[PDB]
Amino acid sequence: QPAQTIPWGIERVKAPSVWSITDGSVSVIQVAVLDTGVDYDHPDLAANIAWCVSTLRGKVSTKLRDCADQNGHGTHVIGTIAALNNDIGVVGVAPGVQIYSVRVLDARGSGSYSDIAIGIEQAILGPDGVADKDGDGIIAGDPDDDAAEVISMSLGGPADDSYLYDMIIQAYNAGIVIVAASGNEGAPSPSYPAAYPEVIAVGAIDSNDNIASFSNRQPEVSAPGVDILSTYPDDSYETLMGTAMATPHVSGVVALIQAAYYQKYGKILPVGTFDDISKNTVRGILHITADDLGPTGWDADYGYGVVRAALAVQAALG
Amino acid sequence: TIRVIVSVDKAKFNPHEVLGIGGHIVYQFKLIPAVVVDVPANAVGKLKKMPEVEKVEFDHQAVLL
Ligand SMILES: [Ca+2]
Ligand SMILES: [Ca+2]
Ligand SMILES: [Ca+2]
Ligand SMILES: [Ca+2]
Ligand SMILES: [Ca+2]
Ligand SMILES: [Ca+2]
Ligand SMILES: [Ca+2]
Ligand SMILES: [Zn+2]
Numbered sequence: 126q127p128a129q130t131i132p133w134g135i136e137r138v139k140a141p142s143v144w145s146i147t148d149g150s151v152s153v154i155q156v157a158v159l160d161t162g163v164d165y166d167h168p169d170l171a172a173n174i175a176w177c178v179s180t181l182r183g184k185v186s187t188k189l190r191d192c193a194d195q196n197g198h199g200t201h202v203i204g205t206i207a208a209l210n211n212d213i214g215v216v217g218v219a220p221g222v223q224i225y226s227v228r229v230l231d232a233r234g235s236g237s238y239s240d241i242a243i244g245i246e247q248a249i250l251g252p253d254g255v256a257d258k259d260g261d262g263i264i265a266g267d268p269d270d271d272a273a274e275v276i277s278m279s280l281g282g283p284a285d286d287s288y289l290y291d292m293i294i295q296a297y298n299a300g301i302v303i304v305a306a307s308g309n310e311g312a313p314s315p316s317y318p319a320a321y322p323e324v325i326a327v328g329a330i331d332s333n334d335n336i337a338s339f340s341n342r343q344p345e346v347s348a349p350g351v352d353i354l355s356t357y358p359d360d361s362y363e364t365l366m367g368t369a370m371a372t373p374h375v376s377g378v379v380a381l382i383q384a385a386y387y388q389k390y391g392k393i394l395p396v397g398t399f400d401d402i403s404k405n406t407v408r409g410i411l412h413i414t415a416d417d418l419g420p421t422g423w424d425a426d427y428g429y430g431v432v433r434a435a436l437a438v439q440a441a442l443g
Numbered sequence: 444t445i446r447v448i449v450s451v452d453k454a455k456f457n458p459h460e461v462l463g464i465g466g467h468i469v470y471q472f473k474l475i476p477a478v479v480v481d482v483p484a485n486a487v488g489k490l491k492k493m494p495e496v497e498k499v500e501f502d503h504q505a506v507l508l
Contacts, residue, residue: 161507183446183469183479198507234507239448239470239479241505246474256474282505287498288448291475306508316508369508 126168126213127362133332134205134349138374139435140218143381146438148210150221151384153266156206156376157248157273159241160199160280161234162192163226164358167200169214173207173221176252179228180243195232197357201365202279204356205373206380214362215355218377218434222384225251225273230280238282241318242292248273249299256299265300266383266393274383274393277376278305278324279369281316290321297323302383302396302407304376306368308341313425315341322399325379325408328428329371334418336426340368344428345399345408346415348374375411378434382407385438394441410440445484450477450498464489 131141149156155175165174177192178185186192194200203224210220229244230236249256249264251271257264265274276296296303303324308316319326319341329337329350337351350371357363383393397406402413412423414437415430423429446469449456453476458468466482479502482490490499 185470196507230505230507236505237446238503238505239446242448242472242475242477243470243479246472249474254473279508280505281508282503284503286448286500286503288450288472288475288477288500291450291477292472295474309508317505367508372508 129211129213129216132215132354134353134374135216135218137349137431138218138378139433140377142435143438144210147381147384147388148221149219149380149384151388153268153387154380154384155223155225155273156275156277156380157225157227158199158203158206158277159227159229159244160202161196161230162194162199162228163203164194164200164356164360165189165192167356167360169208169356170203172209173224174226175223176225178247180240180247181228181231183239183243185243185247192226192228194358196234197363198234198369199226200358201355201363202369202373205353205370206277206377208356218374219380222380236280238284238286238289242289245276245292245296248276249296249301266387272299273301275376275379276301276303277373278318279372281306281308281319283316285317289318293318293321293323297396300393300396302379304372304379306372307344309339309367310341311339312341314343325375327368327372327375329368330431337366342425346375346411346429346432347371347427348432375432378411378432378437379407381434382410382437382441386441389442404440410437414440444481446479446481446502447487448477448479448500448502449490449496451496452476455495
């Protein structure tokens with residue numbers, strides 16, 4: 126194992142200064158990463174892997190054999206959120222956060238919308254198979270339940286399907302922040318599910334603070350997505366580019382916001398909306414504390430700008 | 444044989460009516476009123492015709508980004 130470095134992207138989104146406040150290891154907080162699976166025994170990931178499920182071919186399996194990453198993409202995305210802060214490898218935005226790896230994409234990085242919708246359902250239900258065990262309508266942030274507080278989707282498709290949207294709506298109403306990659310086609314608007322009102326679409330910047338030419342336009346926020354070093358199978362590391370790499374930076378920042386807020390107040394923040402510019406919701410906080418690059422204000426390249434964890438968390442706690 | 448997703452109210456869907464048209468249930472959602480099924484290509488129109496069926500949707504593809 127190599128000695129630890131902090132990848133440039135982790136620095137860019139101002140994560141390291143947050144860690145004295147929280148690294149995301151607040152027990153009610155989990156981030157569900159719907160992707161190609163995870164190298165669950167990776168020395169720089171293993172301790173943060175709280176649940177490993179697969180929904181491939183429409184059957185929910187919790188076997189390690191089935192939830193294992195056969196591609197590498199999921200392991201990479203998870204590492205950017207939650208690689209451990211220690212002596213080796215890299216370090217995530219929220220290096221103590223619990224991860225649910227939900228495998229919805231196969232060995233070649235393709236997935237059916239059905240498997241993705243089943244994946245979202247699993248992130249709401251959690252290990253116990255029940256959304257809201259005590260019937261109080263509180264799901265994300267309820268310490269009695271085991272629902273994820275963030276759903277991270279480094280994937281996209283052109284189709285807008287009513288059932289998939291229904292599932293997105295269920296996650297939103299559970300209080301779960303949904304984050305998704307804007308897409309890699311240099312298109313005028315995000316792919317689905319990023320394009321849904323309830324979901325934070327994430328574009329990619331490079332290490333010069335330029336938007337990546339491939340990044341689909343009109344995102345909500347942007348984040349590091351070119352030359353991103355993270356964990357990769359088997360027990361190794363790799364450098365990749367894509368809106369899939371930007372996404373986990375934002376999910377990580379959300380995890381820090383919600384962890385910090387629960388640590389202080391015993392509740393989580395509401396998800397919020399695209400238009401929100403208050404300090405009263407997760408998305409409002411993300412928008413107002415983002416580094417506003419390009420033209421003043423929200424623009425079609427950067428959205429509201431580059432997320433910054435340090436300021437986000439201060440806005441949450443202030 | 445194709446995989447489709449049928450939108451249908453929990454209380455008015457019987458899993459047993461899809462065998463009749465040559466299909467079988469793949470996954471019944473716990474949190475939305477829908478069911479994933481495998482059916483012969485010719486069965487798609489039949490599903491639509493059912494009064495209880497609000498929508499039949501093809502199983503689309505996403506890719507890693
Ligand atoms: Ca939780
Ligand atoms: Ca391994
Ligand atoms: Ca490390
Ligand atoms: Ca549960
Ligand atoms: Ca509850
Ligand atoms: Ca409760
Ligand atoms: Ca701007
Ligand atoms: Zn079948």
